[PDB]
C-alpha cells in the first residue's frame, strides 16, 4: 500500500518515497473572517475574528506576514484568545459575565466597555432562588 485516503476521497496519509516513514497530510489552515465593530458614531476601532483556526498557526502567520489578505496598518496588540469559533484577535479578554451584545459562538460575546472592545462569557440572566415554603404564597 503506497498511500492512504480519508473517509472522503482525498489522500491524507503517505508512505515516504525516500525513507518509508508513514506520514499524515493535513491541509493548510484556512477559514472565514469576521469584523466586530461598535459603530462609526461610537468609535473607529475594530477587532477581527478569524474562524475555525488554531491560534498557534494564526498568531504566527501574522508576524511572519503569511496571510492573504494582509492589512496596511494593523497589529495584534498581543491579544490572542482561542474560542471554539476561532482566534479572536484585537479584543481584551475579561473574566466576568454580562449579557450578549455581539455574538461570537461557544458561549462568547463581545461589546464595548471601559473605552475598548472586550470579550467574555455570557450570563444567562439574573441569578435568583425561590424557597419551596410548605405554607406560604
Amino acid at each position: 500500500q503506497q498511500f492512504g485516503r480519508d473517509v472522503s476521497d482525498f489522500t491524507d496519509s503517505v508512505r515516504d518515497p525516500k525513507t518509508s516513514e508513514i506520514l499524515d497530510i493535513s491541509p493548510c489552515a484556512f477559514g472565514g473572517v469576521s469584523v466586530i465593530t461598535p459603530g462609526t458614531n461610537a468609535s473607529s476601532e475594530v477587532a477581527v475574528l478569524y474562524q475555525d483556526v488554531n491560534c498557534t498557526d494564526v498568531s504566527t502567520a501574522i508576524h511572519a506576514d503569511q496571510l492573504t489578505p494582509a492589512w496596511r496598518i494593523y497589529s495584534t496588540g498581543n491579544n490572542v484568545f482561542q474560542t471554539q469559533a476561532g482566534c479572536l484577535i484585537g479584543a481584551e479578554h475579561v473574566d466576568t459575565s454580562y449579557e450578549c451584545d455581539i455574538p461570537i459562538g461557544a458561549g462568547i460575546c463581545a461589546s464595548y466597555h471601559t473605552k475598548s472592545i472586550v470579550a467574555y462569557t455570557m450570563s444567562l440572566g439574573a441569578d435568583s432562588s425561590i424557597a419551596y415554603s410548605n405554607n406560604t404564597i
Partner: protein, 411 residues
Amino acid sequence: AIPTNFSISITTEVMPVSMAKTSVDCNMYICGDSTECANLLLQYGSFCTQLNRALSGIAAEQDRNTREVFAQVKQMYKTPTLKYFGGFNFSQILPDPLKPTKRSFIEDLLFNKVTQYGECLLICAQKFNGLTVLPPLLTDDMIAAYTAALVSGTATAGWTFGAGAALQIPFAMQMAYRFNGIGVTQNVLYENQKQIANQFNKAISQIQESLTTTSTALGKLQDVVNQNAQALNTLVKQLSSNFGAISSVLNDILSRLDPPEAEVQIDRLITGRLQSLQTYVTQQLIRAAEIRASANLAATKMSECVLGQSKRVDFCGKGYHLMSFPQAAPHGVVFLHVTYVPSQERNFTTAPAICHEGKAYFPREGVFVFNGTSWFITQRNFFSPQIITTDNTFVSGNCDVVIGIINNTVY
C-alpha cells in the same frame, strides 16, 4: 356515561429546533487550491459574495431558534435542595448536583440513544473539502441550564413564573389549581394525593425503562442528523463528477494537459461545481424553513404548554394536559406530558330539568343523574354526587317545555 377513576401517565413529545450551521469557502470547494480556477472564477463574477450571504443568513437563524425556544426565562432560578414535593419525586428531572454532568438522569439517556468536514472541537483539524461546521451560540451546558431553571422555577412558582414574578406556592396548591382548569374539583387532588403522587412517581419510572431498553422514540432527532449527512455527502460526491471534462481533477487538467486543453476543461468543472454549489445552498434554504416551522411549534409549546396550561385539544398531550417538562436533547426539545385520562365509566340516566311548582328548573353546571334512587348534579369528568339545592339550579318557564322533565322537587 360518566367516569369516577382516572389515570395519570407520561407521553414523550419530541421536536427538533435547530440543525447544524455550516459555511463554505468557495476557493477550496470550487477551485481546489488551484490558481487559474480563481482567475476563471473572477470572470464569472463575485457570486460567492452572495453564496456566503445565504449560508450566513441561515447560520444566524439557528442561533435565534435555539434562543427563542429556551431563553424565554428572565431569571435563572437555582435548583432547590430537597427534590421531593409532597411525594412528588423530581429527582430524575432536575439535575443531580453529585454528577459532573450538569444533566438530569433523563438527559443522559437521551444523548446515548442518538449517539468529512472541518471542525475545531480541544483539537482543531481541517479537511481538504471546504466544509466547516461552526459550533452553536449556546453550548449544551447553557441548554441544560435553561432546562433546569424551567423545572426548578416551575416546581416552586407554577404558572405565576409564566404569568409574572415567580411567586411562591406549594406544589400541592399548584396541581389543585391545575385540576381547576379541567373542571375537576379540589377534592380530586387532596383526597387522592397519595396515589396521585404515586402514579406520577411510577410514570417517570416507565419512561426510564422505556428509554434504557430501546430507542426510535427519538427518530425525528435522528433524521435531522441524517439530512445533514446526505446533503454534505452529495456535496462531496459531486466533486468527483467529470462534467464533460476528461477528469474531475482541476490540477491534472492544469498540469498534465495542454494550456489550450486546460481552459476548456477548467471552465467546465467550475460551471458544473458552481451550480452544484447553488443547489446545496437552495436545499439548505428550504430545509431551514421547516426547522423554522418546527422551532415555532416548540416556542409555543414552551410558551403555552410549559408556562400556562393549554385549553387546546390533542395539543401537547393526548387527553387533558396538566404540566409540561422541557428537556434538552441533541438538536431539539423533548417534552413530557402530565395528562388527565379518565377511565372506568358506568351508565347513568340523565334528564333535562325538574318539574316542581309547575316550573322548569335549569342547571348552572352539568346534568341531573338518576342514581337508580336519587337525582343529583355532577360533572362529566369524575362521578360527583352534588345534591340539587336552591342555588345550584335556577328557574325559567313552566314544566314540559323540556321533553322528559322529572317529577322531582328542588330540595
